[PDB]
Design a protein around this ligand. Structure first.
Ligand code: HEM
Ligand code: HEM
Ligand SMILES: Cc1cc(N)nc(C[C@@H]2CNC[C@@H]2NCCNCCc2cccc(F)c2)c1
Ligand SMILES: Cc1cc(N)nc(C[C@@H]2CNC[C@@H]2NCCNCCc2cccc(F)c2)c1
Ligand SMILES: C[C@H](O)[C@H](O)[C@H]1CNc2nc(N)[nH]c(=O)c2N1
Ligand SMILES: C[C@H](O)[C@H](O)[C@H]1CNc2nc(N)[nH]c(=O)c2N1
Ligand SMILES: [Zn+2]
Lengths: 407, 410
């Protein structure tokens, strides 16, 4: 019931006790491991509220104090009478920071306590949502010196009045299918790009068209808004050694800002809660650029490198992969836009893991997601055993809202 | 139940029904996933069920479930167990058993090859000397002058657990490791402990960087004995780079035959504690893990130094660049010498084809994503994007602890 975790490179062994505080289900059983699967009332709410407030009061070291008991009473009163309750500002900030702390798939958690929370619970309209999001985008970007932030819109009520950002990220590039049969721009966003057209967006029809926001307030039909172009920081991609690299026409945006997840704090559900940090280079250079279902540029780059593409065993894909990612990193760095490489990020995560074991009794971690999609075993996370379990407050994936909406 | 797996690159969805025949436990619970944890004498009572289950599978695979041959064999085995407390596999059953243990091995990307396995029955073996001879023959047969052939040699099964046959080497061919008084290691640091045991047992160590270890062989629960594999049987490949002429001067070589010798083979509830098996390498096992792990030969710095890369910051990706060059060299060197090897693109692509076939014809293919994804260039291989379900089928290969921890010295 107490579990050990071993690092096979350093022999360091850590004991996990935090896992006994998990409640939610993994999807695994005693017979089947689903570790690699991407998606594995009033009576219900008060145990959730209590559990959260207990840990909150424990963290500020007022557990079992009069203020603790008073608050548990106050929330109990409010649930019984309204069927929900409102978080205090202090509880909101704590909850959001801990949802990040608990995100087992996030390599960047050393930073968890440095998170700027924007309380947008007073928002009532899509226009209001747009304003809050522009202010988030500008604060977080900080002229290239990126700062982690979350903006939190009003909580679910009866679930017929949900706030949602329809984009999966605040900033993404459009995707268009061509009479050609191919795809122009980002193939990931073809479906969403069509929905934007169907609501009236005028697409430049380019390879890198920043999508408009589709914001839904109060369960209403979503509305289109364009982010001011001067708020969207982008980086043209060049290579420090290869002159020709620039002419591939590549760029990426500086701000990764996930907007499709659901924040749960103390049993309350925040269905629109865009958050942002800064990129690890591989996210762009390995995944966005080289996934076959994405911009898929390996073939074009290898050709410009004059590599022999006749057989897989020349590792031409692998050589091109490295150079692409060198370029991504160099370009961000030259432009003073925060980026972290996979060596540095994973090293910091090991240090974070050791702090969390020492000071909290464990750290939930999803090895499948923590190990970078290139050079896995030359990063220290590869050799690190990790236990994966679900703690609250949490971020959860939620389905693309267009499937689950009436007009 | 029907469980779905999706490939996020192709949107191909597959349905697993085979997991319903899984008995053994994963280490995982509804509350905790131990998917990245490396390590997550019977009774008559349990033995006949295990036998029956195995023989039922065997007979149904040969399209004879329920036949008189089937019913008679069940009866024969039952009686043998009741009377002798164990039983002996027929040759046909051993072969089937060993092939399926490989077929069931979740962590093996090489499984498209499962049905082509040469089984050597070494159940008549009685002494360490006999074990040595069997192993030499395996090495020579499997090596096949560089045209590698998969094989397994199966020594007598466990009886009371007091008379186990064991190969003390973790692989038949490995390089010695020598911890120096200044804290440095010469040769393979993974093998320091075993090297020290060999030396204690009387091995005279060459004390170089690539000394092939002697075999330490335990027969019938006796103290193990040392044997040197004839050097002309140990095929090796000096590593060079197609473009970089200085690469040879690093003095690297590797052996051609990967031959795992420390695992336990379970068939029909019988335990084969000595069952060395072998195939051929995927390049990354050598170029990524053996050469570039910090706890192993650790050559990244020296290679990047010779490539004159910018080494002052990790963000230049000097480690990644040198990693790719080292792995090009390994594949190039094996190919040039006509020693079978497979690159990680070809290997993973074949594995996806294998896996899809296995779903169609078997109802599933248990696979451990943590191990199946190669340790470089993960997401540019098709397996990265492939959802997998990990569960335990028997016959199986199991890790067992190193015998020097458990062995009682006579
Ligand atoms: C500060 C720098 C940050 C870095 C370097 C970072 C890095 C990463 C990486 C590399 C992943 C893997 C996901 C992928 O590859 O798509 C990830 C996932 C995730 N991150 Fe972090 N992150 C950062 C900030 C944050 C912040 C501020 C939050 C919350 C406030 C957060 C929460 C999450 C969550 C919930 C996931 C899983 C996302 C999903 O399931 O799609 N991250 N992060
Ligand atoms: C024929 C070519 C083969 C290739 C290319 C191949 C490839 C691999 C690779 C890359 C691994 C991961 C283990 C590691 O990286 O250390 C592995 C593991 C494994 N393989 Fe295969 N393999 C082959 C043949 C075989 C054969 C013949 C058997 C048994 C008859 C086998 C059974 C296993 C088992 C039991 C594991 C897990 C090992 C452990 O837990 O340490 N493989 N294989
Ligand atoms: C199906 C599904 C489930 C799930 N949980 N998720 C997804 C989005 C996928 C995951 N992986 C690629 C893509 N998500 C792409 C961007 N994710 C960046 C995470 C991040 C990084 C740095 C800073 C941040 F604030 C946030 C899909
Ligand atoms: C702790 C622990 C548990 C476990 N199950 N296992 C280990 C051996 C580790 C796995 N990973 C590195 C090292 N084993 C290296 C040898 N693996 C060869 C697999 C192979 C390849 C080609 C053909 C074959 F026949 C067999 C350690
Ligand atoms: C099927 C598999 O789980 C899937 O491809 C995962 C693997 N690891 C990942 N890791 C990260 N960081 N992000 C991802 O999107 C994925 N995808
Ligand atoms: C901690 C982690 O499970 C461990 O390092 C695993 C990861 N994946 C692996 N994959 C393979 N093929 N071989 C290994 O030795 C390992 N090691
Ligand atoms: Zn699991």
């Amino acid at each position: 019931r107490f579990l050990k975790v071993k690092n096979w490179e350093t022999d360091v062994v850590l004991t996990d006790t935090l896992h006994l505080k998990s409640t939610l289900e993994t999807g695994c059983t005693e017979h089947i491991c689903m570790g690699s699967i991407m998606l594995p009332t009033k009576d219900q709410l008060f145990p959730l509220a209590k559990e959260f407030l207990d840990q909150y009061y424990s963290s500020i070291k007022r557990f079992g104090s009069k203020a603790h008991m008073d608050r548990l009473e106050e929330v109990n009163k409010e649930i019984e009478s309204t069927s929900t309750y409102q978080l205090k500002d202090t509880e909101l900030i704590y909850g959001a920071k801990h949802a990040w702390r608990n995100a087992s798939r996030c390599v960047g958690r050393i930073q968890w306590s440095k998170l700027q929370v924007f309380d947008a619970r007073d928002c009532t309209t899509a226009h209001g949502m747009f304003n809050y999001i522009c202010n988030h985008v500008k604060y977080a970007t900080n002229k290239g010196n990126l700062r982690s932030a979350i903006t939190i819109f009003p909580q679910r009520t009866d679930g017929k009045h949900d706030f949602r950002v329809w984009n999966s990220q605040l900033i993404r590039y459009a995707g268009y299918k061509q009479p050609d049969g191919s795809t122009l721009g980002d193939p990931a966003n073809v479906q969403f790009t069509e929905i934007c057209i169907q609501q009236g967006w005028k697409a430049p029809r380019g390879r890198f068209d920043v999508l408009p926001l589709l914001l839904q307030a109060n369960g209403n039909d979503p509305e289109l808004f364009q982010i001011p172009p001067e708020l969207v920081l982008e980086v043209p991609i060049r290579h420090p050694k290869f002159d020709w690299f620039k002419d591939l026409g590549l760029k990426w945006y500086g701000l990764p800002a996930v907007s499709n997840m659901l924040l749960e704090i103390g049993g309350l559900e925040f269905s629109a809660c865009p958050f942002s940090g800064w990129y690890m280079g591989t996210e762009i250079g390995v995944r966005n650029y080289c996934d076959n279902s994405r911009y898929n540029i390996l073939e074009e780059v290898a050709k410009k490198m004059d590599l022999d593409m006749r057989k897989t065993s020349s590792l031409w894909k692998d050589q091109a992969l490295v150079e692409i990612n060198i370029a991504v990193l160099y370009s961000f760095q030259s432009d003073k836009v925060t980026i972290v490489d996979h060596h540095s990020a994973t090293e910091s995560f090991i240090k974070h893991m050791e702090n969390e074991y020492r000071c909290r009794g464990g750290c939930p971690a999803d090895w499948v997601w923590i190990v970078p999609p290139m050079s896995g075993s030359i990063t220290p996370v590869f050799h690190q055993e990790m236990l994966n379990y679900r703690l609250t407050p949490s971020f959860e994936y939620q389905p693309d809202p267009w499937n689950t909406h009436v007009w």
